[PDB]
Protein backbone atom coordinates (compact mmCIF):
# COMPACT_ATOMS: atom_id res chain seq x y z
CA UNK A 1 0.00 0.00 0.00
CA UNK A 2 1.40 3.31 -1.21
CA UNK A 3 -0.47 6.45 -2.22
CA UNK A 4 0.04 8.67 -5.27
CA UNK A 5 2.84 10.65 -3.63
CA UNK A 6 4.80 7.54 -2.64
CA UNK A 7 4.33 6.04 -6.10
CA UNK A 8 6.49 8.85 -7.52
CA UNK A 9 9.17 8.42 -4.85
CA UNK A 10 9.27 4.65 -5.35
CA UNK A 11 9.98 5.13 -9.05
CA UNK A 12 12.62 7.80 -8.45
CA UNK A 13 14.52 5.72 -5.89
CA UNK A 14 14.99 2.84 -8.33
CA UNK A 15 16.59 5.36 -10.69
CA UNK A 16 18.68 6.98 -7.96
CA UNK A 17 17.32 10.36 -8.95
CA UNK A 18 16.02 13.47 -7.28
CA UNK A 19 12.53 14.59 -8.19
CA UNK A 20 12.74 17.14 -10.98
CA UNK A 21 10.86 20.42 -11.08
CA UNK A 22 8.24 19.13 -13.51
CA UNK A 23 7.45 16.31 -11.06
CA UNK A 24 7.06 18.56 -8.02
CA UNK A 25 4.58 20.75 -9.90
CA UNK A 26 2.59 17.67 -10.88
CA UNK A 27 2.43 16.89 -7.14
CA UNK A 28 1.65 20.45 -6.08
CA UNK A 29 -1.45 20.35 -8.27
CA UNK A 30 -2.56 17.11 -6.62
CA UNK A 31 -2.52 19.13 -3.40
CA UNK A 32 -4.42 21.88 -5.23
CA UNK A 33 -7.13 19.39 -6.21
CA UNK A 34 -7.16 18.40 -2.58
CA UNK A 35 -10.47 19.38 -1.07
CA UNK A 36 -12.24 18.17 -4.22
CA UNK A 37 -10.89 14.67 -3.64
CA UNK A 38 -12.13 14.59 -0.05
CA UNK A 39 -15.53 15.81 -1.20
CA UNK A 40 -15.82 12.73 -3.45
CA UNK A 41 -14.81 10.32 -0.67
CA UNK A 42 -17.25 12.02 1.72
CA UNK A 43 -20.11 11.60 -0.75
CA UNK A 44 -19.59 7.89 -1.49
CA UNK A 45 -19.27 6.88 2.17
CA UNK A 46 -22.18 8.95 3.49
CA UNK A 47 -24.44 7.09 1.05
CA UNK A 48 -22.56 3.79 1.16
CA UNK A 49 -25.53 1.79 2.43
CA UNK A 50 -27.81 3.22 -0.26
CA UNK A 51 -25.36 2.48 -3.08
CA UNK A 52 -25.24 -1.22 -2.22
CA UNK A 53 -28.89 -1.88 -1.43
CA UNK A 54 -30.19 -0.07 -4.53
CA UNK A 55 -27.74 -1.69 -6.93
CA UNK A 56 -28.57 -5.08 -5.44
CA UNK A 57 -32.31 -4.45 -5.80
CA UNK A 58 -31.69 -3.47 -9.43
CA UNK A 59 -29.57 -6.57 -10.09
CA UNK A 60 -32.15 -9.22 -9.21
CA UNK A 61 -34.78 -7.32 -11.18
CA UNK A 62 -32.73 -7.66 -14.36
CA UNK A 63 -31.52 -11.18 -13.50
CA UNK A 64 -34.38 -12.87 -11.62
CA UNK A 65 -32.74 -16.30 -11.95
CA UNK A 66 -30.27 -15.44 -9.19
CA UNK A 67 -32.94 -15.50 -6.47
CA UNK A 68 -34.95 -18.45 -7.72
CA UNK A 69 -34.48 -21.74 -5.86
CA UNK A 70 -31.29 -23.02 -7.42
CA UNK A 71 -29.82 -19.57 -7.99
CA UNK A 72 -26.59 -18.41 -6.45
CA UNK A 73 -28.18 -15.80 -4.23
CA UNK A 74 -31.11 -17.78 -2.87
CA UNK A 75 -31.05 -18.22 0.89
CA UNK A 76 -30.60 -15.86 3.79
CA UNK A 77 -26.86 -16.52 4.08
CA UNK A 78 -26.23 -16.48 0.33
CA UNK A 79 -28.11 -13.21 -0.01
CA UNK A 80 -26.23 -11.61 2.88
CA UNK A 81 -22.91 -12.78 1.43
CA UNK A 82 -23.89 -11.12 -1.85
CA UNK A 83 -24.46 -7.75 -0.17
CA UNK A 84 -21.28 -8.32 1.85
CA UNK A 85 -18.96 -8.60 -1.17
CA UNK A 86 -20.37 -5.41 -2.67
CA UNK A 87 -19.63 -3.47 0.52
CA UNK A 88 -16.06 -4.80 0.60
CA UNK A 89 -15.36 -3.78 -3.01
CA UNK A 90 -16.96 -0.37 -2.41
CA UNK A 91 -14.86 0.02 0.74
CA UNK A 92 -11.55 -0.65 -1.00
CA UNK A 93 -12.43 1.53 -4.00
CA UNK A 94 -12.89 4.48 -1.65
CA UNK A 95 -9.49 3.60 -0.16
CA UNK A 96 -7.95 3.91 -3.61
CA UNK A 97 -9.77 7.19 -4.23
CA UNK A 98 -8.38 8.87 -1.12
CA UNK A 99 -4.92 7.47 -1.93
CA UNK A 100 -4.85 8.38 -5.60
CA UNK A 101 -3.53 4.91 -6.36
CA UNK A 102 -5.13 1.51 -6.88
CA UNK A 103 -2.40 -0.25 -4.90
CA UNK A 104 -4.46 -1.00 -1.79
CA UNK A 105 -7.39 -2.15 -3.92
CA UNK A 106 -5.54 -4.94 -5.70
CA UNK A 107 -3.16 -5.79 -2.84
CA UNK A 108 -5.86 -6.91 -0.44
CA UNK A 109 -9.17 -6.99 -2.23
CA UNK A 110 -8.64 -8.33 -5.76
CA UNK A 111 -5.83 -10.90 -5.34
CA UNK A 112 -7.51 -14.26 -5.78
CA UNK A 113 -11.06 -12.94 -5.99
CA UNK A 114 -11.44 -14.36 -9.49
CA UNK A 115 -10.33 -17.83 -8.38
CA UNK A 116 -12.56 -17.65 -5.30
CA UNK A 117 -15.69 -17.17 -7.40
CA UNK A 118 -14.68 -20.02 -9.71
CA UNK A 119 -14.32 -22.33 -6.71
CA UNK A 120 -17.71 -21.43 -5.26
CA UNK A 121 -19.42 -21.48 -8.64
CA UNK A 122 -20.48 -17.85 -8.40
CA UNK A 123 -21.15 -16.33 -11.85
CA UNK A 124 -18.38 -13.76 -12.11
CA UNK A 125 -20.02 -12.00 -15.05
CA UNK A 126 -22.98 -11.16 -12.82
CA UNK A 127 -20.63 -9.89 -10.12
CA UNK A 128 -19.19 -7.50 -12.70
CA UNK A 129 -22.71 -6.21 -13.46
CA UNK A 130 -23.05 -5.37 -9.76
CA UNK A 131 -19.75 -3.44 -9.71
CA UNK A 132 -20.89 -1.41 -12.72
CA UNK A 133 -24.23 -0.68 -11.05
CA UNK A 134 -22.34 0.63 -8.02
CA UNK A 135 -20.08 2.60 -10.36
CA UNK A 136 -22.69 4.86 -11.93
CA UNK A 137 -24.66 5.09 -8.69
CA UNK A 138 -21.59 6.77 -7.16
CA UNK A 139 -20.40 8.59 -10.27
CA UNK A 140 -23.79 10.32 -10.43
CA UNK A 141 -23.52 11.06 -6.71
CA UNK A 142 -20.06 12.58 -7.12
CA UNK A 143 -21.00 15.23 -9.68
CA UNK A 144 -24.00 16.80 -8.02
CA UNK A 145 -23.43 20.09 -6.23
CA UNK A 146 -25.63 19.78 -3.09
CA UNK A 147 -23.52 21.75 -0.64
CA UNK A 148 -20.32 21.97 -2.67
CA UNK A 149 -19.12 25.08 -4.51
CA UNK A 150 -19.38 25.04 -8.28
CA UNK A 151 -16.36 23.81 -10.18
CA UNK A 152 -14.77 21.17 -12.36
CA UNK A 153 -14.32 17.69 -10.88
CA UNK A 154 -14.20 15.94 -14.25
CA UNK A 155 -10.73 14.40 -14.02
CA UNK A 156 -11.34 13.01 -10.52
CA UNK A 157 -14.67 11.41 -11.45
CA UNK A 158 -12.89 9.83 -14.42
CA UNK A 159 -10.30 8.55 -11.93
CA UNK A 160 -13.02 7.09 -9.69
CA UNK A 161 -14.58 5.34 -12.68
CA UNK A 162 -11.23 3.69 -13.38
CA UNK A 163 -11.10 1.98 -9.99
CA UNK A 164 -14.60 0.56 -10.48
CA UNK A 165 -13.55 -0.73 -13.90
CA UNK A 166 -10.36 -2.27 -12.52
CA UNK A 167 -12.35 -4.14 -9.88
CA UNK A 168 -14.83 -5.33 -12.52
CA UNK A 169 -12.26 -6.93 -14.83
CA UNK A 170 -10.28 -8.45 -11.93
CA UNK A 171 -13.33 -10.47 -10.87
CA UNK A 172 -14.18 -12.48 -14.00
Amino acid sequence: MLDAFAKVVAQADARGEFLSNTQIDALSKMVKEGNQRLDIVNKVTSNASAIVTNSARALFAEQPQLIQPGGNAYTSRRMAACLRDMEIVLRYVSYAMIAGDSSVLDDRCLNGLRETYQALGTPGSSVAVAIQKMKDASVALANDTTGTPIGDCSSLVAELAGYFDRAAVSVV
Binding site: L2, A10, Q11, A14, R15, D106, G112
Partner: peptide
Protein backbone atom coordinates in the same frame (compact mmCIF):
# COMPACT_ATOMS: atom_id res chain seq x y z
CA UNK B 1 -3.79 -6.37 -13.45
CA UNK B 2 -2.03 -6.12 -10.11
CA UNK B 3 1.22 -7.20 -8.58
CA UNK B 4 2.09 -10.89 -8.41
CA UNK B 5 1.08 -12.70 -5.20
CA UNK B 6 2.73 -11.40 -2.05
CA UNK B 7 4.45 -8.48 -3.79
CA UNK B 8 3.41 -5.19 -2.18
CA UNK B 9 2.45 -3.15 -5.24
CA UNK B 10 4.90 -0.32 -5.64
CA UNK B 11 7.59 -1.79 -3.39
CA UNK B 12 9.02 -4.14 -5.99
CA UNK B 13 12.74 -4.83 -5.76
CA UNK B 14 13.20 -5.31 -9.51
CA UNK B 15 12.32 -1.74 -10.53
CA UNK B 16 15.71 -0.44 -11.66
CA UNK B 17 17.64 -3.68 -11.45
CA UNK B 18 20.53 -3.92 -13.87
CA UNK B 19 20.06 -6.30 -16.75
CA UNK B 20 23.46 -7.91 -16.19
CA UNK B 21 22.41 -8.93 -12.66
CA UNK B 22 18.68 -9.31 -13.31
CA UNK B 23 17.07 -12.58 -12.24
CA UNK B 24 13.78 -13.60 -13.82
CA UNK B 25 10.87 -13.64 -11.40
CA UNK B 26 9.57 -17.21 -11.03
Amino acid sequence: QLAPPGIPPGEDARNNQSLRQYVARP
